[PDB]
Amino acid sequence: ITENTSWNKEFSAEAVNGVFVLCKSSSKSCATNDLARASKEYLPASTFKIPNAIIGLETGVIKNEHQVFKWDAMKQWERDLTLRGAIQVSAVPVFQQIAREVGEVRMQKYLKKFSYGNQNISGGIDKFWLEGQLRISAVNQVEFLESLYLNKLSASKENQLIVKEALVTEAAPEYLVHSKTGFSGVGTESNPGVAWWVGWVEKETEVYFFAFNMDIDNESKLPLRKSIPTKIMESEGIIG
Amino acid sequence: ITENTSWNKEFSAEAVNGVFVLCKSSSKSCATNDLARASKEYLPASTFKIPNAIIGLETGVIKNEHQVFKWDGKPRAMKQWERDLTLRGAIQVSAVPVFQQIAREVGEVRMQKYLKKFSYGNQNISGGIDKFWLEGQLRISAVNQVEFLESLYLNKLSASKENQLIVKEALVTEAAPEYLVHSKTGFSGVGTESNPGVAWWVGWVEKETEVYFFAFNMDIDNESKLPLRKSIPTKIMESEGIIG
C-alpha cells in the first residue's frame, strides 16, 4: 500500500480528519491519503451489518434471502422490511435481535474466521459494534470486502451471494456498486464520532475496493462520507 | 388471470398491438390487458439470455460469476460489444455473439434438457444451435415468462441456488434501499409490415416487502418505437402505485 498525500486536498476544504483506501483488482494494489490512519481501528457502526447478516444466515437465525422482518422513536423502525431493506435503511431493532440470537460465543467464532478488526465484542451483545469495544481499520474493511467479493469468507457461497445483492446501491449495464454506510453518531470536537462508506465498484471488467472513514463532530458534515470518496474516485477516472 | 381493459388506454395512443402481464406476490394473481395475447407465444429474442446464462453456469461452460468474456479484436455488429465483458455486462448490453458461443458449447442435447426442466415455451430449439431463439422455432408467451421468472426469484429452477443467485444479480437494473428491479429486454427485429418483429421487457419489481412479476411484448415494424417496450409497462405499473 502506497501513500498519496495529494488526496488530502479533498479533506482539507472541509476541515475533515479522515482516510480513504482505494484498491484496484485486489488488496495487493492499494493507495491511501494517510498510511497511519488507514490502519487505525474505529467503531464499525452499521458497516457491521455486513458480517452480522452473513452470520445470521450461516447460523440459521435468518432463514433465507426472502425472510421478512415484521414490525411487532424512529418511524423507520415501524415498518416491515426485507433483508435488503433492513441492511439499507435504519433498522436498529432488527440487527440487535439478530445479534442476540446469534450469541456471543458464535459471534466471536465468526469474527475470528473473518479476521474482523480487533475481534473485541465486549460492550453488550446488541451494541458492541456501535457503543462497545469493536474496532476495524479501513485496510481491514477492504480485505474483508475482497474476501466477500471472491466468496472466500468462511460461509456458504449462497449466503455470501445473498448478502452481496443486498448491498447493491448503484446499477448500470457496465457499472455496479456494492456499498454500505456507517455512522456512530455526531460527537464533539474533542470526542468525535466516526462515519464510514465502504464497498466496491465494478466498472467494465475492473473492480475497485474502497473504504472511507472520517471523524464527525457536526451533523451537517455527514454527506462528505460519500462526496469525498466520490471526488477522489472521479479524479482516478473511475466514475467518468 | 382477470383482464384489465383500462390498461389498453396506454396502448391506444401509439396504435400498439401488445400485451402486459402483471402479477402481485405470485403467478396465481395476474392481470393483463389482453387475455388472448397473454398466452400467445413469440420468439424470446434477447430475453433468452436469462435461461442461456443459467444453463451456461450449470453445465460449467461459464466458470463462475467473475468470468470475463474477452474480445478478440474482430468486428462485432454493435460497437458496444467490442470490448471485454463480464457475465452481467454481456447480459445487460445483450451481447449476442457471447451467448451464441455459450449456446454452441452447451450443445443441442443439454440445451433441450434444460429447456424441458425450465418448462420454457414450446421447447423447440430447431433452426441452429446459435439462432433458435433469434430466428428459429423457439416461442414463449408473456404468461410463461412470468412463471419462469417467478421460479428464478424463488430459486426453484432445476439449477443450483448459487447459479440462480448469480444470474439474479446480473439482472438488476434499478436499485434503491426499498426498491429493486430485475429486468431484461428483447427485440427480434422489424420483420415486415405483414410479419412484424416482437419486442419484450420482462422482469420483477421488489417494492418494500411486496414483489411484482411482469412481462411485456408488442409487435414492432419500426425501430423508432422500441422504447415503448419499457414506457408502456412503466406507465401501467406507475399507475398501479409500483414506483420508487
UniProtKB/Swiss-Prot annotation, chain A:
Changing residue 128 to S: Increases resistance to ceftazidime about 30-fold in P.aeruginosa strains PA01 and PA14. Optimum pH is between 6 and 7. Keywords: Antibiotic resistance, Disulfide bond, Hydrolase, Periplasm, Plasmid, Signal, Transposable element. It is an enzyme of class 3 (hydrolase). GO terms for molecular function: beta-lactamase activity; penicillin binding. Its EC number is 3.5.2.6. Dimer. This is Beta-lactamase OXA-10. It comes from Pseudomonas aeruginosa.
